[PDB]
Structures are given as structure tokens and as C-alpha cells.
Design a protein around this nucleic acid. Structure first.
Length: 1085
RNA sequence: GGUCUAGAGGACAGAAUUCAACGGGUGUGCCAAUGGCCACUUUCCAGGUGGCAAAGCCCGUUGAGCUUCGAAGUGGCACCAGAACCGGAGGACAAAGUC
DNA sequence: GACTTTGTCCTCCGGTTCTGGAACCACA
DNA sequence: TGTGGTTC
DNA sequence: TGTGGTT
């Protein structure tokens, strides 16, 4: 309900080692205590425990079985009865097991599916289960917080709330379980960890009437917590595994019921390729099974195969596969799958039903995921060094051991923390101590914290660059942490210790005692994806109650109504456009008097959405220039050299194979062609490689196998040892190298926070991995060892780099949404200023379904991980809480393919750079200009500067503006997508206005397209309607309500096919003809 | 100034373009930002493990020397975390088949 | 550079389920 | 504003 | 090319 932030703080423990060893001892104690109680809970559960399987990561084993639990549980219970000196009934094994299980279901209600408060369950039971003289849980004690009906009865009047106390107390079996435990001599069930032989710490002596220390109460809660979430996962894994088995069986008899002979045929296919495979021997059940990844682009290959003869030779089937791959190599599947699907015996899989193989691939995915699906969540006890938990410390006033944050205890910015209870270690004995004050290492992050009230040392103020007035806040709980790397070690040194302090920060809205900001009633956010919907009824009165008054920054959220849409990307991290709700009674702007751009708003005819500004929120490193292009090329020059040098080293290695027909085919590829016509290698290593080739040329055929093979391996060593010194020096220049480093603020940097610099780092990792796992013996597989780490420090740098990019991306978006711009003065040299009125909503694209998937090619999956847009989305929701900024999503399908101003569909284009058209030393054509020149054969045609090149993936969106041939509307693709999201917000856009899935059928005697009813909006418009044709391309609606479905598209602007419903294929080719067909025809002249 | 609208910090193309001493401090990191030496890992490279060492880093003041108008300028940025868990996918190696 | 199949190892990205309390009464 | 057992 | 990203 309130924004919680963690500020991690480092303790200066140099001058006091006795406390550092005490903090470490306290860490081992709290972990031991939590492990003790957690292990107890697992025995009460008396079900199977599963652990991580060694000797193979994947499945799971049974660490401890149910009988093992019950047998060990009873051993503890019987021994406890003896320890408690029980002279009453001992209870049968079954009685004691049932009691323990009852207790367990009270301590972890998630085990049976109920809800549980780890705070109040641990408070309720620790003393009754560990205090010899405890009276809690029963109904005897008069202390405790008053019931809710007693608080009402004294002020706030009762009748129903006193009833709910009794009817909940009736279903409370705590008192009976406790009394049962007592009658069985288990009145203390467990031990108080601190007051037990397990701990060697000389704790402060127990007061009268005390058995439990605050340290034990922390330990016990943290055991309940982990035990609750795990039981929740035990239930979740089992449920999800049940729905998989149901998915498998509900699929075969709902997809290919009458298609049983094809199932038997693809099975023959999958074992055909299984036996005929030269790869590694199969071990998985679904090995060589037909997956969607291998069938990528099978739709195109199948239609092209349909226009062929079943008895035709292979090459016309095969060359029909090569043409589908050449159209785009990224979105293509397996050649060998299509090669075997062209064989006549297997042709029936795609001939009869052209969608059967993709259907059966979904079945195979269900088969594989089921073979790996777990049925239980692994159970892992805490450990002080392997799986650490951290000792908690309540704020001042809390019930645990507390701490105060001491502002400026030792100097201007020399803060301190006073632990009111701690551990001190002197000459090997741990002793509990009071009131230990520990200085904190300097932290500019702490400069955002100011003390609020001297009488209440918990209060604070919270600074933020995007808030004119500091937020009010309070210190919260803290936890003592160490680094994971300084944990598994022991050594003999005096290990940094940190305190992770939770800060609770109150937003300006929260400070006014309102559950939600007043503008939250205008925007409906739905689901976990925060799908944004506008209450068009309510924004007419909101503008009346909240008129724009010009207040900037955080002071303007209660005046005006603005939404900022954001188009995340890789080239530019964020592209935004800001719109303001305003009456259509407006005027001309301050610049040159041009009617402003606006969008109509559904419902209100008096109100429009006026465009305020658009901006490219580039993170540093996302610029480009002649010199920047050069440095980025040079920074990877030697890397790209070594990468191709290694690729030919492996060609040389294959020449020493024991397989005649492998070394001969490999030795051919080395002598047939020159070594480096592209000049991609280094000179000196290439010369060394050429020497070894010409040396082997004077031995090939002349010599014997075991004498030629021996020389090939001896030439690999010379060349590998040579390249080994090159990899050695390259790394020296990467770490120790003296490259220029920016000072102060500077725009236009080499890498910055860009994708390319992170990939510049990633590229180095991949090559080093490839270099270390390079094999001098042909055919051998070299993988990493079962617990190895590779390039630890480089890997940690790559991860930190992505973390910094993520947080700076979200902050840039939020600072812009609030209306702050980082501006330079050179007398101040950069400062956040409030330049614009803020936006109450940040509108992102709905991309939750744009996930990594095996159907996607790996290069597309890789970019999605580089991008990690969902991470950006989650970091936005985090950082927006304090500022009262709503972040929502908009349905994004075709957001980048239709014009935001016009509505007409379009194509993403690039413009020719002047580098390639200048007559004085022209630079080579890029990749996309080459592919375009080749498709239309424009080798003899002179391209001009800024010539539009339709590539389908450029940064410039082009759409037809009218029937005029050539009349284009061009706008930044990302900004056009951003404005499309805005246009969809104010009009309640549904995809059914533009795209429709239909199936053929009979309605009024004629064959028509029956639209699929998906969602209430598609049903509200097209349920009673049906589409007819005269030609098969252009469809028209009626009013009455093959085997594959048909997708109909529509141009809302009426420019393409007069906005009639058109089949998807021909629709996008009409779009192509009016843009690409025109640009090509004009270049040819 | 050329191209393109959204008319904005507009977007594309183009033309243009660091020592020293002393004092204090070194939360997590990033910005061209991936530490150094030794030993071990059978072997040289990569990677890892361990050991050692001084610092390297910022900030301030006083000097120099640079570089633009005697003055100024020799650093900027971001930060909500903890544990466990279930998934989704990358990466590397070998064979084979493909643009 | 891009793409597929086989296995096995290290890594990363996304989401879940717990969490980072409050307050009364007898103490001696 | 104590703690420690106790209830919310 | 055809949801979203962009070699």
C-alpha cells in the first residue's frame, strides 16, 4: 500500500573486529535457528521431501520419504516425552502422528490450501510450543491487543463483529491441539534455540517468566515463511502437472480424431530421422520429434509444393525449399525436415491436411514439457553459507531486536547505526551485548535521507529529483547481509558486513489520506498487464474539477489530464509522445500558427486529445556519427579477427580426422580457395597458417595416414600456440588497456547504456568460451565441467551493465512523464528542471505475449533477452509508485504497421545515407541496401541521398496518403507506434475494426466467411454479420449471421482497396505495390 | 542550409569537432570503466583456484602544465530489496544438412 | 552472418510466494 | 517510547 | 515481409 525502498548500507568495522565477528556469529546462529525449526516443520508434515538431483540436472530425487519422516518424527516425540518426564498417557504412534500433522496444518495452512499470516502464526505458537509454562493459544490469557469489536465498542460503533469473533473461535482447533499435546507430555514440543545446547553464545540471562529471546522469534517466523511459500508451490506444481496430463489427453481426441493414419506416419518419420541421424545418440523420449521450430515457414513451402507433381524429381521440390529460405534466412526452419517431407512416402502429412504437422508439433511440445515437468517443489533447508537467510532487525519501537539510524553521529555525512542488541566476540567466546553504535561507510545514496522529527527517530524525509517537495517517510526493518562470494570462504581475515535498511516512503497522494489519486477514477487498469481503459463518462467533469493551471513538475498532477505513450525499442530505448485532454475550443500555437495535432475522444464531442510533444528518450550511447562509427568498428577489430581465425583452425583440425571422406572433404575446403580474400584475419597469423597449408600440400597423397595425421596435429599446435599469444595480448589491452574515459557529462558516447555496448561485452564472453572450449582433436565434444564458472568478473560486469541500463531507462521515462528535463548550463553543468506539466498516466504497449519461445528463431529470442521489455515494464511500476504515476498498457497489434494520423497501413523504411552517394570516396552499401538492390536488380541505378528504401524493418514509417501515386506520409516509426497507442486509448480501439478471422460455411445458401467471435467487442459488431465475395480477394458484409481460416484486413482510411475487407495476403501486397512498387519504378528511371 | 512532421530538447541524413603534494573519503554499480604480481590447475593460451601486495579510485585546497573565452573549465549518471521455488529461453562444444 | 536435428554443461529472463508488524498487560 | 508473553 | 523487436 506504501512504497517500500531498500537502501543498503555498509558498516565501517575496521576499528572494531569484536563486533564484526559478532555479526558473523549472529549470522550463523540465525541460520542455524531457522534450519532447526524448518527441519521440525518438515517432520510434522510427514510427507515426501524432494531435493535437487546430482549427477544430472533436471529430474528430482527423494531426499527423505514419508516413512523416514514419521519414523524420525516419532523418535523426537518419544524422546521429548521422556525429557518432559511424562507420566501420563504416551499415545499410540498413529495418535501422535495425527496430532503432529494437525499442528503442521495450523502452522502452515498452505499445506491444505488455506491462507496463513507468517507474522501471527509464529507469534501464536512459538511460546506454546517451546515455553514449558506457556498459556498462549488457549483462552486463558487476559493480555494481548483488544479484538476489533472491542475497539468499535469503545469508539466507532459491534453487533456483527462480536459474532465473527465467536464463529471464528469455534473453528479454531489451536486450543484443542495444544491441550492434546499437553496430555501427551509434549507441552514443550520444541526447544528455544538460544536456550539450548545448539548455541554456544553466552546470551543475556533470561528474566523471570521468560523462555524465548527475540532472536528466537525472528528465527521462527522466517521458518514459517519459507515453509508457507514452498507448500504453496507444492500445490502449484501439482496442479500445473495435472493440467498438463489433461492437456495431453484432451488434445489427441480433439484435433486429429479422424486423422489417425497421419499420426502413425509422422511417428515413422520421427524414428526415420532418429536412425539416419549422424549426430549424437538420442536419449530423450521426444528426440527428433517434429517441433514447430523445425517447421518454421512451412506455410510458404507447402503452398509452393502444392503447384507441383507428386512424382516430380527432388530438385524441384528442394529448390522450392531453398527459395523460401532465401526470402529471409532468419524465419526458416529445418532443411532436412522439408527434404524428408518431399519424399513421396511422407508427402501425405502435408498433402491431405496442410495444418496437421503444426497441430502435431503442439502435441509434441506438450509431450516434451510433460516429460520434464516436476510434480513437487524441491525442498532445501537454509544454510549459513550455501542458502543464507539474514538476521532481521525491527525499527525503533518494533518487537524484535531494534536499531536506530543516527544522522551525522560523527560528522557532516558520517552517519551511524545503533544496534540495541548484538553479539560481541572476544577471544573466541560469543557474548550478547547492548547498545552498539556502528559507523556507516560514506554513501551518496544516503544523502536522500533527512531526519524529520527529533522526538520520533524513525521519521525521515526522502529526496527525489522529480519531486519539488521531499516525501515523508519512516525507517522500517533492516537485515544484516554479507556478499555471497565472501560467504563460502573462511580464511583468517576481518569480510564486509552490510545493513539492508527498508525505507517506507509516502507519496503526495498518500499524504493527503486518499486511497488512490483523484485521476485514478478516470483510467481503468485491468489485470496484471495493467490494460488501460478510459472512463469516458468521468473525464468531462474531471477537467472541470481539475483545470490546467500551468504548474510544473510534481506540483501539477492535480491540474490537467495528460497521458504519455512510450514505444520501447533497441535502437532507441524509449520514444514518447505526450497528449493533453482539452476542449476543442482551442487556437493556434506560438511557433508559426499551425493547427495542432489532436485525436478525437470517444463519448465527449467537446473534448479532444491535443498533442503536446514527442521526444526520443535515447539513453547514452544510442547516437551515431562518422567518428563514433569508426571507434565502434575499431573497438571490435581484433575480436572479429580472432573469431574468424578460430573458424579456420577448426577447419584444419577436421583434416586430421580418422574418417576418410571427412578429412578429404575438409582438406578440399582449405586448398580449393585462397585463405582470406576478405582480409578478415591478422597478417602474421594468416602467414603462419598459409605456411602450414603449403607444407601439408607437399605431403597430401605422398605420405601415409598415421604420418600425415601426425603432421596436421603438429601444425595445429604451432598455429594454436601462435593465436594463443594473440588472445593473451588482446585481453591485456581489454582490462589494463588505456582507453579514453569521459570526464563529467558528455553527449555522444561510444557505448553508454546502449544494447550494442552490452553486446560488445557479450561478444567477448562468447568468443572466450569458444576459445577455451576449442578442441584440437576432431570430433570431440568439450563442455564445461559440472560446477565450473567462466569469466566470472566479465560476467558480473555484463549483468551490472544490464542492471544500470534498466534502472536508468525507467528513471528517464518517469522523469519525462513528470515533466523534468536534464538540461546543461555549463555554469551549473547539468541539473533537473521542471519544464512541462506532468502526465498522470504512462501508456506502454501491451507486450506480455511477446515472450521467448522455441518457435522463434534463436536470434529473435536473443534480442528479446537483450531487450527484456517486461523487465522495463516491471521496473517502471516499481519506480512510479512514489510519484503517483499510473503505468498502463495498450493493445499493440499492428501499432507499427498502420498510420497514427491517417489510419492507412504502411511499411517500415530506411533512407539512403549520404556516405554511399557522395562522389568523393563513397562508402560501401549496408546490408539492407544490398538486399534491396539485389531483389529488384538495381545495380546500374544511381541512388540519391535520403532515398526511401522499403525494408520492412527500418526506422521510418511510410504510408500512402491518397490515391496519388507517390503521395506518402513519413514519420518516425517508433513515434508513430507511440501515437498509435495514444490514438487507441481515446477511441476504445479493438482489433476487430481492422482485422478479422473467419471460417467458411453456409448461411443463406451461399458460401460466405463466418467471423470468429473473440471477445464481447467482436461479438457486438459482427455476430449477426457474414462476408461474401465475387473474386476471393475483396469481401463485403451481409446481415444473416475449404478448411483453413481466412484473415480479412481493412484500411480505415479507405486508401487501400477503398477500405473494403481484403484477404490478408493481397491486402499487404497492395500496401507493398503503392510504396515499394512506386519507389522501385522511379529508381529505374 | 538538404530530407521528413509531431512543429519538439524535433527526427534523419550531412558539413564541423590528463600530473604533484597535502588532507579527507572510498555504499552498489555503469559511463570506451572487464584490476596488478606470483603460485597452482601436467603442458604454452583461455578459464579457474589460492596467495601476496601496494594501491588504484573519488572529494577538497595549494601548485604547476595543457585549452577555449586576467578569468573560466580538468567527473558525470542511476539505484527496491531478501529467500526459496516453478518456468521460459539463450550461450558453448561435436557431427550432419542448409542460404 | 542466418537456419535445423541430436546431448550436456554454464548463464540469463520472467513470474510466484512468502517476507522487510502492531499493540495490550503484568512486571517488581 | 521499556521488555516478554500474548492477541490482532 | 504481416502483433511486438530488427539483421
Amino acid at each position: 500500500s506504501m512504497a517500500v525502498k531498500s537502501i543498503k548500507v555498509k558498516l565501517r568495522l575496521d576499528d572494531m573486529p569484536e563486533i564484526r565477528a559478532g555479526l558473523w556469529k549472529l549470522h550463523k546462529e540465525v541460520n542455524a535457528g531457522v534450519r532447526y525449526y524448518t527441519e521440525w516443520l518438515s517432520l510434522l508434515r510427514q510427507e515426501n521431501l524432494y531435493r535437487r538431483s546430482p549427477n544430472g540436472d533436471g529430474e528430482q530425487e527423494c531426499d527423505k520419504t514419508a516413512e523416514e519422516c514419521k519414523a524420525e518424527l516419532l523418535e523426537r516425540l518419544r524422546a521429548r516425552q521422556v525429557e518432559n518426564g511424562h507420566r501420563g498417557p504416551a499415545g499410540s504412534d498413529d495418535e501422535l502422528l495425527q496430532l503432529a500433522r494437525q499442528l503442521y496444518e495450523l502452522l502452515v495452512p498452505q499445506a491444505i490450501g488455506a491462507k496463513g499470516d507468517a507474522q501471527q502464526i509464529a507469534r501464536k505458537f512459538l511460546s506454546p510450543l517451546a515455553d514449558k509454562d506457556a498459556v498462549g493459544g488457549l483462552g486463558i490469557a487476559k493480555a494481548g491487543n483488544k479484538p476489533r469489536w472491542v475497539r468499535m465498542r469503545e469508539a466507532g460503533e459491534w453487533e456483527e463483529e462480536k459474532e465473527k469473533a465467536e464463529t471464528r473461535k469455534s473453528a479454531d482447533r489451536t486450543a484443542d491441539v495444544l491441550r492434546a499435546l499437553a496430555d501427551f507430555g509434549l507441552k514443550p514440543l520444541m526447544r528455544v534455540y538460544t536456550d539450548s545446547e545448539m548455541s554456544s553464545v553466552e546470551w543475556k540471562p533470561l528474566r523471570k517468566g521468560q523462555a524465548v529471546r527475540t532472536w528466537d522469534r525472528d528465527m521462527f517466523q522466517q521458518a514459517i515463511e519459507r515453509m508457507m511459500s514452498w507448500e504453496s508451490w507444492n500445490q502449484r506444481v501439482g496442479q500445473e502437472y495435472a493440467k498438463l496430463v489433461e492437456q495431453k489427453n484432451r488434445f489427441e481426441q480433439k484435433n486429429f480424431v479422424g486423422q489417425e493414419h497421419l499420426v502413425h506416419l509422422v511417428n515413422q518419420l520421427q524414428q526415420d530421422m532418429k536412425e539416419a541421424s549422424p549426430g549424437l545418440e538420442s536419449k530423450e523420449q521426444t528426440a527428433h520429434y517434429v517441433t514447430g521450430r523445425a517447421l518454421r515457414g512451412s506455410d510458404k513451402v507447402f503452398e509452393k509444393w502444392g503447384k507441383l507433381a507428386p512424382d516430380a524429381p527432388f530438385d524441384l521440390y528442394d529448390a522450392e525449399i531453398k527459395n523460401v529460405q532465401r526470402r529471409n534466412t532468419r524465419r526458416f526452419g529445418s532443411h532436412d525436415l522439408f527434404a524428408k517431407l518431399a519424399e513421396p512416402e511422407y508427402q501425405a502429412l502435408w498433402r491431405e491436411d496442410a495444418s496437421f504437422l503444426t497441430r502435431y508439433a503442439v502435441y509434441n511440445s506438450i509431450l516434451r514439457k510433460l516429460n520434464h515437468a516436476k510434480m513437487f517443489a524441491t525442498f532445501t533447508l537454509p544454510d549459513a553459507t550455501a542458502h543464507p537467510i539474514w538476521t532481521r532487525f525491527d525499527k525503533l519501537g518494533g518487537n524484535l531486536h531494534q536499531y536506530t539510524f543516527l544522522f551525522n553521529e560523527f560528522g557532516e555525512r558520517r552517519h551511524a547505526i545503533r544496534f540495541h542488541k548484538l553479539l560481541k566476540v572476544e577471544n573466541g567466546v560469543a557474548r550478547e551485548v547492548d547498545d552498539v553504535t556502528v559507523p556507516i561507510s560514506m554513501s551518496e545514496q544516503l544523502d536522500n535521507l533527512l531526519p524529520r522529527d527529533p522526538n520520533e527517530p524513525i521519521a525521515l524525509y526522502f529526496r527525489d529529483y522529480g519531486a519539488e517537495q521531499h516525501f515523508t517517510g519512516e525507517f522500517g526493518g533492516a537485515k544484516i547481509q554479507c556478499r555471497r562470494d565472501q560467504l563460502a570462504h573462511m580464511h583468517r581475515r576481518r569480510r564486509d558486513v552490510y545493513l539492508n535498511v527498508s525505507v517506507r516512503v509516502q507519496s503526495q497522494s498518500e499524504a493527503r489520506g486518499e486511497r488512490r489519486p483523484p485521476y485514478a477514477a478516470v483510467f481503468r487498469l485491468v489485470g496484471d498487464n495493467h490494460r488501460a481503459f478510459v472512463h469516458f463518462d468521468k473525464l468531462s467533469d474531471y477537467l472541470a474539477e481539475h483545470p490546467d493551471d500551468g504548474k510544473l513538475g510534481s506540483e501539477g498532477l492535480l491540474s490537467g489530464l495528460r497521458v504519455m505513450s512510450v514505444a520501447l525499442g533497441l535502437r532507441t530505448s524509449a520514444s514518447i509522445s505526450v497528449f493533453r485532454v482539452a476542449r476543442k475550443d482551442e487556437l493556434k500555437p506560438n511557433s508559426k500558427g499551425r493547427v495542432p495535432f489532436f485525436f478525437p475522444i470517444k463519448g465527449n464531442d467537446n473534448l479532444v486529445a491535443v498533442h503536446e510533444r514527442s521526444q526520443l528518450l535515447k539513453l547514452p550511447g544510442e547516437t551515431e556519427s562518422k567518428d563514433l562509427r569508426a571507434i565502434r568498428e575499431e573497438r571490435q577489430r581484433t575480436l572479429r579477427q580472432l573469431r574468424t581465425q578460430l573458424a579456420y583452425l577448426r577447419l584444419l583440425v577436421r583434416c586430421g580426422s580418422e574418417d576418410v571422406g571427412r578429412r578429404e572433404r575438409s582438406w578440399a575446403k582449405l586448398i580449393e580457395q585462397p585463405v582470406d580474400a576478405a582480409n578478415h584475419m591478422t597478417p602474421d597469423w594468416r602467414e603462419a597458417f598459409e605456411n602450414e597449408l603449403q607444407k601439408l600440400k607437399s605431403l597430401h597423397g605422398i605420405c601415409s595416414d598415421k604420418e600425415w595425421m601426425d603432421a596436421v596435429y603438429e601444425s595445429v599446435r604451432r598455429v594454436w600456440r601462435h593465436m594463443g599469444k594473440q588472445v593473451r595480448d588482446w585481453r591485456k589491452d581489454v582490462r589494463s588497456g588505456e582507453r579514453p574515459k569521459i570526464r563529467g557529462y558528455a553527449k555522444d558516447v561510444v557505448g553508454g547504456n546502449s544494447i550494442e555496448q552490452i553486446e560488445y561485452l557479450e561478444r567477448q564472453y562468447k568468443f572466450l568460451k569458444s576459445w577455451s572450449f576449442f578442441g584440437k582433436v576432431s570430433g570431440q565434444v568439450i563442455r564445461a565441467e559440472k560446477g565450473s564458472r567462466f569469466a566470472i568478473t566479465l560476467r558480473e560486469h555484463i549483468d551490472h551493465a544490464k542492471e544500470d541500463r534498466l534502472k536508468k531507462l525507467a528513471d528517464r521515462i518517469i522523469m519525462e512523464a513528470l515533466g523534468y528535463v536534464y538540461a546543461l548550463d555549463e555554469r551549473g553543468k547539468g541539473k533537473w528542471v521542471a519544464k512541462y506539466p506532468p502526465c498522470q498516466l504512462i501508456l506502454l504497449a501491451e507486450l506480455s505475449e511477446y515472450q521467448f519461445n522455441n518457435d522463434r528463431p534463436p536470434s529473435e529470442n536473443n534480442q528479446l533477452m537483450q531487450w527484456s521489455h517486461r523487465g522495463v515494464f516491471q521496473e517502471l511500476i516499481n519506480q512510479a509508485q512514489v510519484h503517483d504515476l499510473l503505468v498502463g498498457t495498450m493493445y499493440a497489434a499492428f501499432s507499427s504497421r498502420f498510420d497514427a494520423r491517417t489510419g492507412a497501413p504502411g511499411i517500415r523504411c530506411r533512407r539512403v545515407p549520404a556516405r554511399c552517394t557522395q562522389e568523393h570516396n563513397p562508402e560501401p552499401f549496408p546490408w539492407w541496401l544490398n538486399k534491396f538492390v539485389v531483389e529488384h536488380t538495381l545495380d546500374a541505378c544511381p541512388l540519391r541521398a535520403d532515398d526511401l528504401i522499403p525494408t520492412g524493418e527500418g526506422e521510418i514509417f511510410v504510408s500512402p496518403f491518397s490515391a496519388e501515386e507517390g503521395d506518402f506520409h513519413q514519420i518516425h516509426a517508433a513515434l508513430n507506434a507511440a501515437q498509435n497507442l495514444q490514438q487507441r486509448l481515446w477511441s476504445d480501439f479493438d482489433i476487430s475494426q481492422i482485422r478479422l478471422r473467419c471460417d467458411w460455411g453456409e448461411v443463406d445458401g451461399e458460401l460466405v466467411l463466418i467471423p470468429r467471435l473473440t471477445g464481447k467487442r467482436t461479438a457486438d459488431s459482427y455476430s449477426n454479420k457474414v462476408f461474401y465475395t465475387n473474386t476471393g480477394v475483396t469481401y463485403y458484409e451481409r446481415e444473416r449471421g475449404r478448411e483453413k481460416s481466412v484473415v480479412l484486413m481493412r484500411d480505415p482510411s479507405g486508401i487501400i482497396n477503398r477500405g473494403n475487407w481484403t484477404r490478408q495476403k493481397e491486402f499487404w501486397s497492395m500496401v507493398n505495390q503503392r510504396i515499394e512498387g512506386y519507389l522501385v519504378k522511379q529508381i529505374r528511371s
